[PDB]
């Protein structure tokens, strides 16, 4: 099964990207299975709720006692060289917290990197029902 490993925050970059020190190496991580509105959108720039999603991720990781990363069962890096992972701040998955708050959508899913897909989809359905942020 999947396992958590320790990492150290270097810098939060956007809602869905964080730079971490991982096994003694600075690395950029892209959060698995979620799309947040972005502040650094290639074509668009700052989308609606982009600053909000980005402040949420930042606070969560900056204020944590512990950060852990959890790789899935498939490829662990994307074509930009970013680590592909679930990120935990004090035992709470950042990927799910964004989706539960209506600050991210569940992304298009690529097996076999889909271990937490069902759980995220449940939180997404709940944030839509509660009409939170993006779903308002």
| Length of the chain in terms of residues written | 136
Question: Does residue 16 have a known ligand-binding role?
Answer: yes
Distance CA 100, CA 90 (A): 17
Cβ atoms of 36 and 56 closer than 8 Å = no
The domain over range 1-136 is classified in CATH as 2.40.50.90: yes
**Domain residue limits, the chain:** 1-136
117 is catalytic: no
Q: How was it solved?
A: X-ray
Measured at the alpha carbon of residue 19, what is the angle toward residues 47 and 105, in degrees to the nearest 5? 40
76 is catalytic: no
82 is catalytic: yes
Question: Does residue 90 have a known ligand-binding role?
Answer: no
Q: Which entry of 30, 96, 100, 124 is annotated as an active-site residue? A: 30
* Cα–Cα separations (whole angstroms), residue 134 to 57, 68, 121, 126, 128: 16, 27, 15, 12, 8
Question: Does residue 36 have a known ligand-binding role?
Answer: yes
Q: Which entry of 70, 76, 82, 117 is annotated as an active-site residue? A: 82
84's enclosing H/E stretch is strand 83-89
What tokens does 21 get?
């020190």
Q: Which entry of 38, 68, 96, 124 is annotated as an active-site residue? A: 38
Distance CA 82, CA 84 (A): 6
């Amino acid at each position: 099964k999947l396992h958590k490993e320790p990492a150290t925050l270097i810098k939060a970059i956007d809602g869905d990207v964080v730079k971490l020190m991982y096994k003694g190496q600075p690395m950029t991580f892209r959060l698995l299975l979620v799309d947040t509105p972005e502040t650094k959108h290639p074509k668009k720039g700052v989308e609606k709720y982009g600053p909000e999603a980005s402040a949420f991720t930042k606070k969560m990781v900056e204020n944590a006692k512990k950060i852990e990363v959890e790789f899935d069962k498939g490829q662990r890096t994307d074509k930009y060289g970013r680590g592909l992972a679930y990120i935990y701040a004090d035992g709470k998955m950042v990927n799910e917290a964004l989706v539960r708050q209506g600050l991210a959508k569940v992304a298009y899913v690529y097996k076999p990197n889909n271990t937490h897909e069902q759980h995220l989809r449940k939180s997404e359905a709940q944030a839509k029902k509660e009409k939170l942020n993006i779903w308002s």
